[PDB]
C-alpha cells in the first residue's frame, strides 16, 4: 500500500510552490550591566543576617514588621466574687486572676488603670519561625530586636515600604530594645529526636525580661480593656497604638541569613479553673493547696493584613565597581545588578521583510562559579526577560508572564546557558510599534529622530525571579504559575559578553532567526 512517491514531481509544480526555501541568519546583540534602581519587593519573608563574599563584599539584612490583631480579640474578664449578707460566696464570673498580696500569686505582675486591677502578666515572648536559611549552619550569630515608633519617628505605610533600602534609624529609637538572642540556624541545644519530627519548624525564641514584659503586656492589655469598656472592638489599628511593631537587627555573626517566615508574639497570663455550673474557683485535687490555676495566652502575628519591610544592604562601592567591568556582565540578585540587552529589531525588519518568522532564539551563557567554596552563592535558577518599558511596571502591577512581552527560562546546568528559544512575538510587537508610529506620522516621519527619542524601544532586561505554582489539579498535572516576584535570596552568575562589545566584535552575542522565504 505505498504512500510516498518519493521526491519525483517537484520540477513540474508551479513556481510559487517549488521556490519556497528555509533560511538561517544571525544578528548581533550587545549586553551590559545596569544598576537595579528602586525595585518594588513586597514579599512576606523577612531576611535577617550577614555574610561576606570576596567578590561582592559584605551583605547585610534586617527587617521591620507590624503585628496583627483579629477583629474583636479580647483577654478573659477578671474573676469577680459574689457574696450574700453573711459574707459567704455564692457565685462568681470571669476567669483571670486579679487578687494580689497572696504569696501564691508572686509568679505574676498585676497591672492597673486608675486604681483598679485589670489583669496580670506572666510573660511576653517572641518566636521568629523559619523553614530555611542561607549559608553555614554552625556559625554562632547574635540578633537583637527593638520596638518601632516613638517621639518624632516615622511609621510604616503603603508608600514608605517595599523599597529595599529604607533607613530604619528613623522608624525606631535605640532605647526601646526588647531583647536579644544568640543562634546558629540549626539549634544543637534541641535533641536530635525532636529535630527529626515532621511537625518541627525551627525558630529563634527571644522572650523578654520581666520589666520589658510588664511594660509591653500591660500596654496591650490596657488597650484591649479600654476598647472593650467602650463597646468598641479591638481591631488592629487600636492594637497599633499600644505596640507599633518590631525591628529585627543583626549585631554579630557572618554567614547565616535566616528566612523568617512569620514573627509571632505571645502574651501570657494566669487564670483560675472555674466550676461549670456555679462559676466558683476549683480547689486543687492534690493534698494541701489553696486553689487551682493555669496559664493561657493570646497570639499576635504578622499575617499579610499588616505591613512588613526589609533592608537589603549591598556594599555600594563594590557593586558600582563591578557594574563598570566591560568584558562581562553580572546578575547579582538581591537588588544588585541586572543585565540589559539591545535587540537588532531594525535589521530584522529590513532583511526579513516578507518572510514568515518560525523561530527567534536568544541565548545568554556564563562562566563557572569561582573558589569551590562550600557555602557560596548559587546561580539563579529561574530568570525573566522583559522589555525595558515594563521593567518596574510589571512587578508593581503584579502581572504574570505575558508571552508577547516577557519570558521565563531555567538555567541549563549541562551547558551553562539561559536559552529562550523563541522570542518571535516580542520582535513582532516591537516591529508593529515602530510601523504604527511611522504610519501615524506619515510624510513628516524621521527615522533617526524617532530612534533618538524612545531609546528603550528595542531594549530588554534580564531579571532573577522567584516563581511559584499552584498545587491543585495534581493527578492530571498542570502546575499553573500564580505569582512571579523578585528573587531576594543571595545569588549571582557571571555572563559572557559585555560593554566592550559596543566596539569590539569578540564580546558581542548573536541572535539566531530561522524563517520561511517565499522567493517573491
Amino acid at each position: 500500500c505505498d504512500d510516498n512517491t518519493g521526491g519525483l514531481g517537484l520540477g513540474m509544480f508551479p513556481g510559487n510552490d517549488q521556490n519556497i526555501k528555509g533560511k538561517l541568519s544571525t544578528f548581533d546583540v550587545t549586553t551590559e550591566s545596569v544598576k537595579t534602581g528602586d525595585i518594588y519587593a513586597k514579599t512576606n519573608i523577612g531576611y535577617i543576617g550577614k555574610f561576606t563574599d570576596e567578590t561582592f563584599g559584605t551583605y547585610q539584612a534586617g527587617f521591620l514588621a507590624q503585628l496583627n490583631c483579629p477583629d474583636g480579640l479580647t483577654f478573659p474578664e477578671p474573676y469577680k466574687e459574689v457574696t450574700d449578707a453573711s459574707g459567704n460566696v455564692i457565685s462568681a464570673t470571669g476567669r483571670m486572676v486579679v487578687d494580689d498580696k497572696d504569696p501564691e500569686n508572686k509568679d505574676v505582675t498585676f497591672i492597673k488603670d486608675g486604681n483598679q486591677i485589670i489583669g496580670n502578666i506572666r510573660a511576653v515572648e517572641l518566636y521568629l519561625w523559619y523553614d530555611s536559611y542561607f549559608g553555614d549552619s554552625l556559625t554562632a550569630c547574635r540578633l537583637s530586636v527593638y520596638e518601632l515608633g516613638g517621639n518624632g519617628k516615622e511609621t510604616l505605610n503603603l508608600d514608605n515600604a517595599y523599597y529595599t533600602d529604607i533607613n530604619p534609624e528613623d522608624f525606631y529609637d535605640s532605647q526601646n530594645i526588647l531583647g536579644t538572642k544568640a543562634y546558629t540556624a540549626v539549634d544543637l541545644s534541641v535533641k536530635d529526636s525532636i529535630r527529626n519530627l515532621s511537625t518541627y519548624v525551627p525558630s529563634v525564641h527571644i522572650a523578654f525580661k520581666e520589666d520589658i514584659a510588664t511594660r509591653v503586656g500591660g500596654n496591650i492589655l490596657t488597650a484591649a480593656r479600654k476598647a472593650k469598656n467602650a463597646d468598641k472592638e479591638f481591631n488592629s489599628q487600636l492594637f497599633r497604638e499600644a505596640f507599633q511593631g518590631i525591628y529585627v537587627k543583626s549585631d554579630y555573626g557572618d554567614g547565616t541569613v535566616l528566612y523568617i517566615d512569620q514573627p509571632q508574639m505571645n502574651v501570657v497570663y494566669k487564670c483560675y479553673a472555674t466550676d461549670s455550673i456555679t462559676g466558683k474557683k476549683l480547689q486543687k485535687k492534690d493534698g494541701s493547696g489553696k486553689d487551682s490555676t493555669y496559664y493561657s495566652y493570646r497570639v499576635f502575628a504578622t499575617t499579610r493584613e499588616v505591613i512588613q519591610a526589609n533592608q537589603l544592604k549591598n556594599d555600594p562601592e563594590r557593586i558600582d565597581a563591578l557594574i563598570k567591568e566591560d568584558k562581562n556582565t553580572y546578575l547579582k540578585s538581591p537588588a544588585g545588578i541586572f543585565t540589559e540587552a539591545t535587540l537588532p529589531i531594525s535589521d530584522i525588519q529590513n532583511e526579513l521583510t516578507g518572510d514568515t518568522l518560525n523561530a527567534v532564539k536568544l541565548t545568554f551563557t556564563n562562566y563557572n562559579q569561582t573558589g569551590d567554596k562550600k557555602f557560596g552563592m548559587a546561580i539563579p535558577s529561574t530568570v525573566m526577560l522583559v522589555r525595558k518599558k515594563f521593567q518596574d511596571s510589571f512587578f508593581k502591577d503584579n502581572k504574570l508572564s505575558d508571552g508577547v512581552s516577557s519570558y521565563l527560562t531555567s538555567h541549563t546546568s549541562s551547558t551553562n546557558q539561559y536559552v529562550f528559544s523563541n522570542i518571535t512575538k516580542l520582535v513582532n510587537a516591537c516591529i508593529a510599534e515602530k510601523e504604527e508610529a511611522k504610519k501615524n506620522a506619515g510624510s513628516s516621519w524621521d527615522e533617526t529622530k524617532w530612534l533618538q527619542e524612545n531609546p528603550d524601544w528595542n531594549k530588554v532586561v534580564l531579571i532573577p525571579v522567584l516563581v511559584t505554582y499552584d498545587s491543585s489539579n495534581t493527578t492530571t498535572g498542570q502546575a499553573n504559575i500564580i505569582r512571579i516576584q523578585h528573587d531576594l535570596k543571595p545569588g549571582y552568575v557571571r555572563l559572557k559578553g559585555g560593554s566592550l562589545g559596543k566596539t569590539n566584535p569578540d564580546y558581542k552575542l548573536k541572535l539566531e532567526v530561522i524563517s520561511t522565504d517565499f522567493g517573491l
Binding site: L73, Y297, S471, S472
Partner: protein, 188 residues
C-alpha cells in the same frame, strides 16, 4: 437521586422565610443608588442565583481603591451550612472558641483573575481550618460576583447555591451562607 438533589431551592426558601429577609432585583439594586438597607434586611438576587447583602461597601473616604485584575485579596469569614443549620468553616475570633489560637490567627488569601471572560480565583494561602477540612485551592465562584460591587475593607453577606460553591458544595449539592467580615487588598 440525580435530579432530586437540585431541590436546594426549597432549602434556600426555608432559610429565607425563617428570618426577616427581603429580596431585591438587581435592576432595583442598581437604581436606588446602590445599597441593601439593613433596617429592612434587603438582599439582592445576583447572577447564577447568588443572594448578597452589602453591610459596608468599604473605603468610604477614599472611594477609589476598588478590586481589579491581578489583585491578591485577604478574606475573613464564617461559613454556615444551609441544609443542617451548623457553623461549618471559619477563620475569625469568637469567644466560644477564643482559646483555639490555630483557627483564627491567619487569613485566607487568593489571587483574583478578571480577563475578558470566566472570572476565577485561586487561594495562595488557605487558613488552617480550610486547609485541613476541604484541602482544595479553588475559591467559591459566588464570592467573585460580589467584588465589582464593593471596595477595599468591605463587609458582605452571601447565600451561595451549589452551582457556584466550592469543591464539596458542588458534589454533595449543598448551599452555604458566608458572613464575610472583610475583603482586603493584600499587604506585604
Amino acid at each position: 437521586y440525580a435530579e432530586m438533589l437540585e431541590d436546594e431551592k426549597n432549602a434556600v426558601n426555608k432559610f429565607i422565610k425563617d428570618k426577616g429577609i427581603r429580596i431585591i432585583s438587581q435592576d432595583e439594586f442598581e437604581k436606588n443608588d446602590t445599597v441593601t438597607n439593613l433596617e429592612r434586611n434587603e438582599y439582592v438576587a445576583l447572577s447564577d442565583g447568588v443572594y448578597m447583602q452589602i453591610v459596608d461597601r468599604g473605603s468610604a473616604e477614599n472611594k477609589t481603591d476598588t478590586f481589579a485584575n491581578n489583585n491578591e485579596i485577604c478574606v475573613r469569614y464564617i461559613e454556615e451550612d444551609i441544609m443542617t443549620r451548623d457553623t461549618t468553616c471559619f477563620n475569625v475570633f469568637l469567644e466560644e472558641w477564643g482559646d483555639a489560637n490555630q483557627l483564627y490567627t491567619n487569613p485566607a488569601v487568593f489571587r483574583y483573575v478578571a480577563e475578558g471572560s470566566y472570572v476565577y480565583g485561586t487561594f495562595i494561602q488557605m487558613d488552617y481550618y480550610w486547609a485541613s477540612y476541604y484541602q482544595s485551592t479553588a475559591v467559591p465562584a459566588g464570592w467573585l460576583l460580589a467584588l465589582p460591587f464593593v471596595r477595599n475593607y468591605a463587609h458582605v453577606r452571601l447565600i451561595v447555591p451549589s452551582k457556584v460553591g466550592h469543591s464539596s458544595a458542588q458534589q454533595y449539592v449543598n448551599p452555604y451562607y458566608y458572613d464575610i467580615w472583610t475583603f482586603s487588598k493584600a499587604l506585604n
